[PDB]
Amino acid sequence: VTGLHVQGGRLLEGNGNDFVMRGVNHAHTWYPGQTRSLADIKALGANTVRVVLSDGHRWTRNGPADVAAVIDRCKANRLICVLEVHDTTGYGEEPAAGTLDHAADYWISLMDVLAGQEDYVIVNIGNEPWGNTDPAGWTAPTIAAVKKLRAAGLAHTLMIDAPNWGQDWQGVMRADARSVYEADPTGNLLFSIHMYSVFDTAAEIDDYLEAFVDAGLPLVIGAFGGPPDQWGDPDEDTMLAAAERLRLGYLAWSWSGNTDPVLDLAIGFDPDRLSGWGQRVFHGVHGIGETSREATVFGKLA
Numbered sequence: 001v002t003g004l005h006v007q008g009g010r011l012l013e014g015n016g017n018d019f020v021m022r023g024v025n026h027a028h029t030w031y032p033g034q035t036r037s038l039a040d041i042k043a044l045g046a047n048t049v050r051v052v053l054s055d056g057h058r059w060t061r062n063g064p065a066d067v068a069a070v071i072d073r074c075k076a077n078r079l080i081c082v083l084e085v086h087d088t089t090g091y092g093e094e095p096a097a098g099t100l101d102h103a104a105d106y107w108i109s110l111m112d113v114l115a116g117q118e119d120y121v122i123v124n125i126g127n128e129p130w131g132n133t134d135p136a137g138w139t140a141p142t143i144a145a146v147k148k149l150r151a152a153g154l155a156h157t158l159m160i161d162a163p164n165w166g167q168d169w170q171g172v173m174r175a176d177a178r179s180v181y182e183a184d185p186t187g188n189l190l191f192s193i194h195m196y197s198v199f200d201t202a203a204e205i206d207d208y209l210e211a212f213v214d215a216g217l218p219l220v221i222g223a224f225g226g227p228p229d230q231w232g233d234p235d236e237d238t239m240l241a242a243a244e245r246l247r248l249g250y251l252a253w254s255w256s257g258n259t260d261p262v263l264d265l266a267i268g269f270d271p272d273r274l275s276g277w278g279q280r281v282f283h284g285v286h287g288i289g290e291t292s293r294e295a296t297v298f299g300k301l302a
């Protein structure tokens with residue numbers, strides 16, 4: 001038995017040890033020059049980074065050599081690597097958005113560089129791959145993309161984002177999760193909820209996470225916020241506490257470089273200059289410094 005995989009609703013390393021993501025998102029595709037971000041993120045205690053890629057539909061395609069380099073750099077910094085295609089974001093509502101099938105073709109094109117990296121790399125098929133229009137339409141192409149990647153021979157653990165821009169507020173991923181999970185013959189599939197202003201009360205967070213846990217289905221919070229936006233105030237204190245209580249993975253949005261800097265954890269990619277949001281995530285109660293454990297595949301650091 002090798003590779004990251006799912007068993008009993010838990011993400012396990014090849015050696016069977018439970019792995020709970022404690023990390024952040026890094027916007028690699030828009031910031032190719034910010035090479036030190038991965039080392040900086042590791043130094044602040046993260047055990048996982050979610051790396052923003054483009055499949056070229058909307059932004060500039062990250063080619064195989066670039067992706068190979070990203071994977072190697074994650075391994076060099078003793079980080080588990082969640083790769084994700086951002087171009088799918090908001091499909092049906094964002095005009096520029098790409099399809100999950102287009103993302104799937106891109107992943108298949110990367111299989112030579114993904115090969116042998118199942119201990120380190122999780123494939124998040126497409127970011128937030130449906131908007132708020134007809135979110136029930138998300139299920140069929142998500143299932144099709146899962147089946148297509150498995151048919152192509154991809155063995156990595158998969159990660160699945162929800163419609164309603166990843167916040168699933170109409171409950172489609174929650175309702176249809178069992179059918180999506182069953183589309184993966186290997187069972188190595190994670191669901192990912194994104195929590196922004198929909199998740200502005202503790203009960204919304206607890207009930208959502210517990211719905212997956214109580215169903216036996218694996219869930220991570222693959223992107224989440226904290227500072228208020230135009231739709232409300234995300235309750236990040238409950239996100240962090242509930243994720244620790246249930247020992248579910250989380251990945252804060254984002255290291256640095258947002259067009260609106262309100263969600264930058266670090267200001268200007270400087271790890272010593274954390275925003276209030278960055279301080280909360282890295283140094284606060286139930287945060288990364290407190291609760292992140294390195295993946296055991298890397299061994300005991302000298």
Ligand SMILES: OC[C@H]1O[C@@H](O[C@H]2[C@H](O)[C@H](O)[C@H](O[C@H]3[C@H](O)[C@H](O)[C@H](O[C@H]4[C@H](O)[C@H](O)[C@H](O[C@H]5[C@H](O)[C@H](O)[C@H](O[C@H]6[C@H](O)[C@H](O)[C@H](O[C@H]7[C@H](O)[C@H](O)[C@H](O)O[C@@H]7CO)O[C@@H]6CO)O[C@@H]5CO)O[C@@H]4CO)O[C@@H]3CO)O[C@@H]2CO)[C@@H](O)[C@@H](O)[C@@H]1O
Nearest residue numbers: 030031089164165166167194196198223231253257258259
């Ligand atoms: O130009 C040269 C320059 O380029 C630079 O690169 C730039 C890139 O080209 C690109 O423009 C990039 O843009 C980024 C941006 O910087 C951010 O990083 C952004 O991060 C997102 C991320 O995806 C998060 O996961 C999350 O995603 C958000 C969406 O962004 C969006 O806000 C959406 O909103 C939903 C919401 O989720 C909810 O459903 C709500 O429902 C409402 C509903 O509308 C009703 O009101 C109802 O009553 O209530 C419900 C419930 O509230 O609807 C809204 C939609 O209307 O939410 C999702 C999460 O759910 O947020 C992050 C912040 O947005 O991604 C962008 C790309 O997608 O920026 C680059 C930097 O500028 C560099 O290369 C530079 O060097 C170069 O010079």
Ligand SMILES: [Ca+2]
Nearest residue numbers: 198199200201
């Ligand atoms: Ca709410």
Ligand SMILES: [Ca+2]
Nearest residue numbers: 226227233234
């Ligand atoms: Ca908040």
